Protein backbone atom coordinates (compact mmCIF):
# COMPACT_ATOMS: atom_id res chain seq x y z
CA UNK A 1 0.00 0.00 0.00
CA UNK A 2 2.94 2.41 0.75
CA UNK A 3 5.16 4.52 -1.53
CA UNK A 4 8.37 2.40 -1.83
CA UNK A 5 10.94 5.01 -3.03
CA UNK A 6 10.06 7.44 -0.16
CA UNK A 7 11.95 7.50 3.18
CA UNK A 8 9.72 9.35 5.68
CA UNK A 9 10.91 12.05 8.09
CA UNK A 10 9.07 13.02 11.31
CA UNK A 11 8.18 16.77 11.17
CA UNK A 12 6.67 16.92 14.72
CA UNK A 13 9.66 19.05 15.92
CA UNK A 14 9.05 21.81 13.28
CA UNK A 15 6.73 24.84 12.93
CA UNK A 16 4.47 22.48 10.87
CA UNK A 17 3.20 21.36 14.35
CA UNK A 18 2.96 24.82 15.96
CA UNK A 19 -0.46 26.46 16.27
CA UNK A 20 -1.31 29.55 14.16
CA UNK A 21 -4.43 31.74 13.91
CA UNK A 22 -5.87 31.99 10.37
CA UNK A 23 -8.85 34.30 10.13
CA UNK A 24 -11.08 33.32 13.08
CA UNK A 25 -9.56 29.79 13.35
CA UNK A 26 -6.86 28.56 15.76
CA UNK A 27 -5.06 25.85 13.70
CA UNK A 28 -3.19 23.27 15.84
CA UNK A 29 -0.80 22.56 12.94
CA UNK A 30 0.08 24.01 9.54
CA UNK A 31 -0.64 21.03 7.24
CA UNK A 32 -3.55 22.27 5.11
CA UNK A 33 -5.89 20.35 2.85
CA UNK A 34 -5.85 22.34 -0.39
CA UNK A 35 -8.91 22.31 -2.62
CA UNK A 36 -9.24 18.97 -4.51
CA UNK A 37 -12.02 18.53 -7.09
CA UNK A 38 -13.14 14.86 -6.87
CA UNK A 39 -16.16 14.97 -9.26
CA UNK A 40 -18.47 13.05 -6.82
CA UNK A 41 -21.13 15.82 -6.85
CA UNK A 42 -24.50 14.59 -8.15
CA UNK A 43 -26.24 15.77 -11.32
CA UNK A 44 -28.79 17.14 -11.94
CA UNK A 45 -28.28 19.67 -9.13
CA UNK A 46 -24.40 19.80 -8.71
CA UNK A 47 -25.18 18.49 -5.19
CA UNK A 48 -22.35 17.48 -2.84
CA UNK A 49 -22.47 13.68 -2.82
CA UNK A 50 -25.30 12.62 -0.47
CA UNK A 51 -23.81 9.12 0.14
CA UNK A 52 -20.08 9.88 0.59
CA UNK A 53 -19.07 13.57 0.83
CA UNK A 54 -19.68 13.88 4.62
CA UNK A 55 -17.58 10.75 5.23
CA UNK A 56 -14.81 11.97 2.90
CA UNK A 57 -14.43 15.32 4.72
CA UNK A 58 -14.92 13.77 8.20
CA UNK A 59 -12.07 11.30 7.52
CA UNK A 60 -9.74 14.15 6.48
CA UNK A 61 -10.89 16.35 9.43
CA UNK A 62 -9.79 13.64 11.91
CA UNK A 63 -6.77 15.56 13.34
CA UNK A 64 -8.32 18.38 15.41
CA UNK A 65 -7.33 21.91 14.34
CA UNK A 66 -6.89 21.10 10.61
CA UNK A 67 -7.70 23.75 7.97
CA UNK A 68 -9.66 22.12 5.13
CA UNK A 69 -10.26 24.02 1.89
CA UNK A 70 -13.14 22.37 0.03
CA UNK A 71 -13.08 21.30 -3.56
CA UNK A 72 -13.87 24.05 -6.06
CA UNK A 73 -17.51 25.01 -5.71
CA UNK A 74 -19.59 26.95 -8.27
CA UNK A 75 -21.28 30.16 -7.12
CA UNK A 76 -23.93 29.94 -9.89
CA UNK A 77 -24.88 27.76 -12.88
CA UNK A 78 -23.14 30.19 -15.28
CA UNK A 79 -19.93 29.77 -13.16
CA UNK A 80 -19.92 26.02 -13.86
CA UNK A 81 -19.98 23.64 -16.78
CA UNK A 82 -18.81 20.42 -15.00
CA UNK A 83 -21.79 18.19 -14.06
CA UNK A 84 -20.06 16.47 -11.11
CA UNK A 85 -18.51 19.50 -9.32
CA UNK A 86 -20.69 20.96 -6.55
CA UNK A 87 -22.39 24.41 -6.40
CA UNK A 88 -23.44 26.51 -3.39
CA UNK A 89 -26.25 28.57 -4.96
CA UNK A 90 -29.30 26.35 -4.17
CA UNK A 91 -31.05 25.21 -0.97
CA UNK A 92 -30.51 21.51 -2.03
CA UNK A 93 -26.74 22.16 -2.23
CA UNK A 94 -26.65 24.23 0.98
CA UNK A 95 -28.44 21.42 2.88
CA UNK A 96 -25.57 19.02 1.97
CA UNK A 97 -22.82 21.58 2.63
CA UNK A 98 -24.28 22.28 6.07
CA UNK A 99 -23.84 18.54 6.95
CA UNK A 100 -20.24 18.66 5.63
CA UNK A 101 -19.38 21.68 7.75
CA UNK A 102 -21.07 20.07 10.79
CA UNK A 103 -18.91 16.94 10.31
CA UNK A 104 -15.67 18.96 10.03
CA UNK A 105 -16.62 21.05 13.09
CA UNK A 106 -17.47 17.89 15.14
CA UNK A 107 -13.77 16.96 14.68
CA UNK A 108 -12.80 20.54 15.78
CA UNK A 109 -11.38 21.28 12.32
CA UNK A 110 -12.10 24.20 9.92
CA UNK A 111 -14.00 24.36 6.64
CA UNK A 112 -13.18 26.98 3.96
CA UNK A 113 -15.21 26.87 0.73
CA UNK A 114 -13.27 27.44 -2.49
CA UNK A 115 -15.39 29.53 -4.86
CA UNK A 116 -14.70 28.39 -8.42
CA UNK A 117 -15.66 30.05 -11.72
CA UNK A 118 -14.49 28.13 -14.83
CA UNK A 119 -14.44 30.53 -17.79
CA UNK A 120 -12.79 28.95 -20.84
CA UNK A 121 -12.08 25.65 -18.95
CA UNK A 122 -15.84 24.91 -18.86
CA UNK A 123 -17.25 22.32 -21.36
CA UNK A 124 -18.99 24.60 -23.87
CA UNK A 125 -21.35 21.83 -25.03
CA UNK A 126 -22.49 21.19 -21.39
CA UNK A 127 -23.10 24.94 -20.97
CA UNK A 128 -25.03 24.96 -24.30
CA UNK A 129 -27.26 22.04 -23.08
CA UNK A 130 -28.19 24.24 -20.05
CA UNK A 131 -28.64 27.48 -22.14
CA UNK A 132 -25.54 29.07 -20.58
CA UNK A 133 -22.78 31.17 -22.19
CA UNK A 134 -19.21 29.97 -22.71
CA UNK A 135 -17.36 32.89 -20.99
CA UNK A 136 -13.82 34.21 -20.90
CA UNK A 137 -11.74 37.44 -21.00
CA UNK A 138 -11.15 37.21 -24.80
CA UNK A 139 -13.54 37.32 -27.74
CA UNK A 140 -11.14 35.22 -29.95
CA UNK A 141 -8.34 33.38 -28.02
CA UNK A 142 -9.47 29.81 -27.19
CA UNK A 143 -7.96 27.62 -24.48
CA UNK A 144 -7.12 24.97 -27.12
CA UNK A 145 -8.31 23.53 -30.49
CA UNK A 146 -10.53 20.91 -28.68
CA UNK A 147 -12.39 23.63 -26.69
CA UNK A 148 -12.74 25.71 -29.87
CA UNK A 149 -14.14 22.74 -31.86
CA UNK A 150 -16.61 21.86 -29.06
CA UNK A 151 -17.73 25.49 -28.68
CA UNK A 152 -18.27 25.92 -32.48
CA UNK A 153 -20.05 22.51 -32.85
CA UNK A 154 -22.44 23.54 -29.99
CA UNK A 155 -22.83 27.06 -31.59
CA UNK A 156 -21.67 28.35 -28.18
CA UNK A 157 -18.68 30.45 -29.25
CA UNK A 158 -16.53 31.96 -26.50
CA UNK A 159 -18.11 35.18 -25.15
CA UNK A 160 -15.88 38.09 -24.01
CA UNK A 161 -17.82 39.02 -20.85
CA UNK A 162 -19.00 42.63 -20.60
CA UNK A 163 -18.63 44.98 -17.62
CA UNK A 164 -22.27 44.22 -16.61
CA UNK A 165 -21.59 40.40 -16.79
CA UNK A 166 -18.39 40.94 -14.70
CA UNK A 167 -20.52 42.78 -12.12
CA UNK A 168 -23.04 39.87 -12.15
CA UNK A 169 -20.20 37.37 -11.45
CA UNK A 170 -19.04 39.61 -8.58
CA UNK A 171 -22.62 39.54 -7.15
CA UNK A 172 -22.66 35.68 -7.53
CA UNK A 173 -19.33 35.40 -5.64
CA UNK A 174 -20.81 37.57 -2.89
CA UNK A 175 -24.06 35.58 -2.63
CA UNK A 176 -22.14 32.23 -2.71
CA UNK A 177 -19.76 33.55 0.02
CA UNK A 178 -22.80 34.53 2.16
CA UNK A 179 -24.43 31.11 1.56
CA UNK A 180 -21.14 29.48 2.69
CA UNK A 181 -20.86 31.51 5.89
CA UNK A 182 -24.56 31.20 6.82
CA UNK A 183 -24.29 27.37 6.37
CA UNK A 184 -21.37 27.29 8.83
CA UNK A 185 -18.18 27.64 6.73
CA UNK A 186 -15.25 29.30 8.53
CA UNK A 187 -14.33 31.26 5.39
CA UNK A 188 -14.09 31.20 1.63
CA UNK A 189 -11.15 31.00 -0.74
CA UNK A 190 -11.42 32.87 -4.01
CA UNK A 191 -9.97 30.67 -6.79
CA UNK A 192 -7.86 32.99 -9.00
CA UNK A 193 -5.45 30.17 -9.99
CA UNK A 194 -4.91 27.23 -12.39
CA UNK A 195 -6.26 29.00 -15.51
CA UNK A 196 -9.91 29.47 -14.53
CA UNK A 197 -11.94 32.64 -15.14
CA UNK A 198 -10.10 35.07 -12.82
CA UNK A 199 -6.70 33.66 -13.97
CA UNK A 200 -7.86 34.10 -17.60
CA UNK A 201 -8.17 37.90 -16.79
CA UNK A 202 -4.78 38.00 -15.00
CA UNK A 203 -2.86 36.25 -17.80
CA UNK A 204 -1.71 38.25 -20.86
CA UNK A 205 -2.05 35.17 -23.13
CA UNK A 206 -5.78 34.75 -22.35
CA UNK A 207 -6.59 38.45 -21.90
CA UNK A 208 -6.31 40.57 -25.10
CA UNK A 209 -9.14 42.92 -24.01
CA UNK A 210 -9.07 46.61 -25.05
CA UNK A 211 -11.18 47.96 -22.09
CA UNK A 212 -10.35 48.55 -18.39
CA UNK A 213 -10.09 44.75 -17.70
CA UNK A 214 -7.14 44.25 -20.10
CA UNK A 215 -4.00 45.76 -21.58
CA UNK A 216 -1.97 46.40 -18.40
CA UNK A 217 -0.95 44.80 -15.11
CA UNK A 218 -3.47 47.01 -13.26
CA UNK A 219 -6.29 46.31 -15.70
CA UNK A 220 -5.69 42.47 -15.78
CA UNK A 221 -5.80 42.44 -11.93
CA UNK A 222 -9.09 44.43 -11.77
CA UNK A 223 -11.61 41.53 -11.80
CA UNK A 224 -9.75 39.45 -9.17
CA UNK A 225 -9.42 42.56 -6.90
CA UNK A 226 -13.13 43.56 -7.46
CA UNK A 227 -14.16 40.02 -6.34
CA UNK A 228 -11.88 40.17 -3.31
CA UNK A 229 -13.21 43.67 -2.37
CA UNK A 230 -16.89 42.72 -2.78
CA UNK A 231 -16.59 39.46 -0.78
CA UNK A 232 -14.48 41.15 1.95
CA UNK A 233 -17.11 43.96 2.24
CA UNK A 234 -19.91 41.36 2.52
CA UNK A 235 -18.50 38.78 5.03
CA UNK A 236 -15.27 40.37 6.47
CA UNK A 237 -11.59 40.10 5.51
CA UNK A 238 -10.91 37.47 8.21
CA UNK A 239 -13.26 35.05 6.30
CA UNK A 240 -11.54 35.45 2.89
CA UNK A 241 -8.50 33.90 1.29
CA UNK A 242 -7.17 34.03 -2.27
CA UNK A 243 -5.50 31.36 -4.39
CA UNK A 244 -2.92 32.21 -7.09
CA UNK A 245 -0.62 30.07 -9.28
CA UNK A 246 1.99 32.53 -10.68
CA UNK A 247 3.98 29.82 -12.58
CA UNK A 248 1.05 27.63 -13.62
CA UNK A 249 0.67 26.49 -17.23
CA UNK A 250 -2.51 24.43 -16.65
CA UNK A 251 -5.50 25.53 -18.80
CA UNK A 252 -3.17 27.40 -21.23
CA UNK A 253 -1.75 29.96 -18.78
CA UNK A 254 1.66 31.60 -19.50
CA UNK A 255 3.74 30.65 -16.44
CA UNK A 256 7.44 31.64 -16.35
CA UNK A 257 7.62 31.87 -20.22
CA UNK A 258 5.91 35.29 -19.73
CA UNK A 259 8.69 37.65 -18.51
CA UNK A 260 6.09 40.04 -16.96
CA UNK A 261 4.43 37.23 -14.94
CA UNK A 262 6.08 38.03 -11.57
CA UNK A 263 5.16 41.74 -11.96
CA UNK A 264 1.53 40.75 -12.59
CA UNK A 265 1.31 38.68 -9.36
CA UNK A 266 3.47 41.14 -7.40
CA UNK A 267 0.87 43.83 -8.23
CA UNK A 268 -1.99 41.65 -6.91
CA UNK A 269 -0.16 40.94 -3.69
CA UNK A 270 0.82 44.65 -3.27
CA UNK A 271 -2.83 45.66 -3.61
CA UNK A 272 -3.75 43.03 -0.93
CA UNK A 273 -1.07 44.39 1.39
CA UNK A 274 -2.35 47.95 0.71
CA UNK A 275 -5.84 46.80 1.80
CA UNK A 276 -4.30 45.13 4.86
CA UNK A 277 -2.58 48.45 5.88
CA UNK A 278 -6.11 50.07 5.58
CA UNK A 279 -7.50 47.52 8.15
CA UNK A 280 -8.76 44.80 5.72
CA UNK A 281 -6.15 42.00 5.82
CA UNK A 282 -7.20 38.70 4.08
CA UNK A 283 -6.95 35.57 6.23
CA UNK A 284 -4.33 34.10 3.85
CA UNK A 285 -2.83 33.92 0.41
CA UNK A 286 -2.58 30.43 -1.03
CA UNK A 287 0.12 29.97 -3.67
CA UNK A 288 0.69 27.00 -5.96
CA UNK A 289 4.43 26.33 -6.17
CA UNK A 290 6.36 26.13 -9.48
CA UNK A 291 7.06 22.59 -8.13
CA UNK A 292 3.70 21.77 -9.81
CA UNK A 293 2.89 23.85 -12.92
CA UNK A 294 0.28 21.25 -14.01
CA UNK A 295 -1.56 19.05 -11.44
CA UNK A 296 -2.34 16.45 -14.17
CA UNK A 297 1.40 15.54 -14.21
CA UNK A 298 3.07 13.15 -11.72
CA UNK A 299 5.21 14.57 -8.91
CA UNK A 300 8.58 15.65 -10.36
CA UNK A 301 7.10 16.38 -13.85
CA UNK A 302 6.14 19.94 -14.96
CA UNK A 303 8.60 21.39 -12.40
CA UNK A 304 9.62 24.97 -13.29
CA UNK A 305 13.13 25.68 -11.90
CA UNK A 306 13.30 29.19 -13.47
CA UNK A 307 11.23 30.91 -10.75
CA UNK A 308 10.24 30.94 -7.10
CA UNK A 309 7.31 32.29 -5.06
CA UNK A 310 9.80 33.84 -2.56
CA UNK A 311 8.93 37.33 -4.02
CA UNK A 312 5.49 36.99 -2.34
CA UNK A 313 7.05 37.19 1.15
CA UNK A 314 8.55 40.67 0.43
CA UNK A 315 5.06 42.01 -0.47
CA UNK A 316 2.28 40.19 1.43
CA UNK A 317 2.96 40.14 5.18
CA UNK A 318 0.09 37.79 6.17
CA UNK A 319 -0.05 33.97 6.22
CA UNK A 320 1.01 32.17 3.04
CA UNK A 321 -0.11 28.61 2.23
CA UNK A 322 2.20 26.89 -0.27
CA UNK A 323 1.15 23.70 -2.13
CA UNK A 324 2.96 21.49 -4.63
CA UNK A 325 4.85 18.19 -4.25
CA UNK A 326 5.63 18.62 -0.52
CA UNK A 327 4.47 15.19 0.76
CA UNK A 328 7.45 13.36 -0.80
CA UNK A 329 9.81 16.23 0.20
CA UNK A 330 9.83 16.66 3.97
CA UNK A 331 13.42 17.98 3.67
CA UNK A 332 11.97 20.95 1.65
CA UNK A 333 9.07 21.38 4.15
CA UNK A 334 11.52 21.41 7.10
CA UNK A 335 13.31 24.44 5.48
CA UNK A 336 10.16 26.27 4.28
CA UNK A 337 8.29 26.12 7.67
CA UNK A 338 11.24 27.94 9.35
CA UNK A 339 9.30 31.03 8.16
CA UNK A 340 6.76 31.55 10.92
CA UNK A 341 3.77 32.48 8.68
CA UNK A 342 4.13 29.61 6.17
CA UNK A 343 1.57 26.75 5.96
CA UNK A 344 1.93 23.73 3.66
CA UNK A 345 -0.89 22.37 1.52
CA UNK A 346 -0.77 18.61 0.76
CA UNK A 347 -3.13 17.69 -2.12
CA UNK A 348 -2.64 14.28 -3.71
CA UNK A 349 -1.32 12.58 -0.54
CA UNK A 350 -4.36 13.86 1.46
CA UNK A 351 -6.49 12.05 -1.17
CA UNK A 352 -4.76 8.75 -0.27
CA UNK A 353 -3.92 9.38 3.45
CA UNK A 354 -6.92 10.49 5.58
CA UNK A 355 -4.47 10.51 8.55
CA UNK A 356 -1.75 12.38 6.65
CA UNK A 357 -1.18 14.82 9.57
CA UNK A 358 -0.37 11.87 12.00
CA UNK A 359 1.93 10.39 9.30
CA UNK A 360 3.82 13.72 8.85
CA UNK A 361 4.06 14.17 12.67
CA UNK A 362 5.57 10.71 13.29
CA UNK A 363 7.38 10.02 9.97
CA UNK A 364 5.14 7.12 8.84
CA UNK A 365 5.04 5.62 5.35
CA UNK A 366 2.50 7.22 2.97
CA UNK A 367 -0.25 5.38 1.14
CA UNK A 368 0.17 5.50 -2.64
CA UNK A 369 -2.68 7.25 -4.43
CA UNK A 370 -4.75 5.84 -7.29
CA UNK A 371 -4.92 8.51 -10.03
CA UNK A 372 -7.67 6.53 -11.88
CA UNK A 373 -10.10 7.35 -8.98
CA UNK A 374 -9.22 11.06 -8.59
CA UNK A 375 -12.33 12.00 -10.67
CA UNK A 376 -14.56 8.84 -10.72
CA UNK A 377 -18.17 8.66 -9.37
CA UNK A 378 -17.05 6.02 -6.81
CA UNK A 379 -16.60 5.51 -3.06
CA UNK A 380 -13.51 3.56 -4.15
CA UNK A 381 -10.46 5.86 -4.10
CA UNK A 382 -12.58 8.39 -2.13
CA UNK A 383 -13.58 7.05 1.32
CA UNK A 384 -11.75 3.67 1.33
CA UNK A 385 -8.11 4.75 1.75
CA UNK A 386 -6.91 3.30 5.10
CA UNK A 387 -5.27 4.98 8.08
CA UNK A 388 -1.77 3.77 8.92
CA UNK A 389 -3.12 1.34 11.61
CA UNK A 390 -5.81 -0.01 9.19
CA UNK A 391 -3.12 -0.40 6.45
CA UNK A 392 -0.85 -2.55 8.76
CA UNK A 393 -3.81 -4.98 9.44
C1 LIG B 1 -7.47 15.55 -8.14
C2 LIG B 1 -7.08 17.00 -7.99
C3 LIG B 1 -8.07 17.97 -7.94
C4 LIG B 1 -7.75 19.32 -7.72
N1 LIG B 1 -8.78 20.23 -7.60
C5 LIG B 1 -8.45 21.49 -7.34
C6 LIG B 1 -9.46 22.49 -7.08
O1 LIG B 1 -10.64 22.18 -6.96
N2 LIG B 1 -9.06 23.78 -6.79
C7 LIG B 1 -7.77 24.16 -6.80
O2 LIG B 1 -7.48 25.34 -6.55
N3 LIG B 1 -6.80 23.26 -7.01
C8 LIG B 1 -7.10 21.99 -7.26
N4 LIG B 1 -6.08 21.05 -7.45
C9 LIG B 1 -4.68 21.41 -7.22
C10 LIG B 1 -4.26 21.07 -5.78
O3 LIG B 1 -4.97 21.90 -4.80
C11 LIG B 1 -2.75 21.26 -5.58
O4 LIG B 1 -2.42 22.64 -5.72
C12 LIG B 1 -1.91 20.32 -6.47
O5 LIG B 1 -2.48 19.00 -6.44
C13 LIG B 1 -0.46 20.33 -6.05
O6 LIG B 1 -0.24 19.88 -4.70
P1 LIG B 1 0.19 18.32 -4.41
O7 LIG B 1 1.51 18.08 -5.11
O8 LIG B 1 0.30 18.25 -2.91
O9 LIG B 1 -0.91 17.40 -4.92
C14 LIG B 1 -6.40 19.70 -7.63
C15 LIG B 1 -5.40 18.71 -7.75
C16 LIG B 1 -5.72 17.40 -7.95
C17 LIG B 1 -4.61 16.40 -8.08
Residue numbers in the entry: 2 to 394
Copy out sentences from the published article reporting this entry, exactly as the authors wrote them.
A family of flavin-containing ene-reductases (EREDs) named old yellow enzymes (OYEs) have been studied for close to a century, yet continue to surprise with its versatile activities. Typically, OYEs reduce activated alkenes asymmetrically following a bi-bi ping-pong mechanism, in which a reduced nicotinamide cofactor reduces the flavin followed by a flavin hydride attack on the substrate’s β-carbon with a local tyrosine as a proton donor. OYEs are classified into several classes: class I are from plants, cyano-, actino-, and proteobacteria, class II are the classical OYEs from fungi, and class III are similar to class I species but are thermophilic-like OYEs, and so far classes IV–VI are less defined. EREDs are able to catalyze the asymmetric monoreduction of α,β-dicarbonyl compounds toward α-hydroxy carbonyls.
A second study showed OYEs mediate vicinal dicarbonyl reduction;9 however, the focus was narrowed to two enzymes from class II, OYE2 and OYE3 from Saccharomyces cerevisiae showing kinetic data only, without knowledge of the enzymatic product and enantioselectivity. Despite numerous attempts at cocrystallization or crystal soaking of OYE2 and OYE3 with 7a, no interpretable electron density was observed in the active site corresponding to the substrate. A new structure of OYE2 was solved at a resolution of 1.5 Å resolution, higher than the previously published 2.45 Å,40 and molecular docking was performed with 7a. Semiflexible dockings were performed whereby 7a was allowed to sample various conformations, with the condition that only the side chains of amino acids lining the active site of the OYEs were allowed to move (semi-induced fit). Productive binding conformations were considered if one of the carbonyl groups was hydrogen bonded to the active site Asn-His pair. 7a was docked into OYE2 with the β-carbonyl hydrogen bonded to the Asn-His pair, and the carbonyls in a cis configuration. The benzene ring of 7a is in an edge-to-face position relative to both FMN and F297. The dihedral angle between the two carbonyl groups in OYE2 is only ca. 18°, which would suggest a high energy conformation for 7a. This could, however, be mediated by the hydrogen bonding of the β-carbonyl group to the Asn-His pair. Alternatively, if 7a were to adopt a lower potential energy by rotation of the intercarbonyl bond, this would place the α-carbonyl oxygen closer to the N5 of FMN.
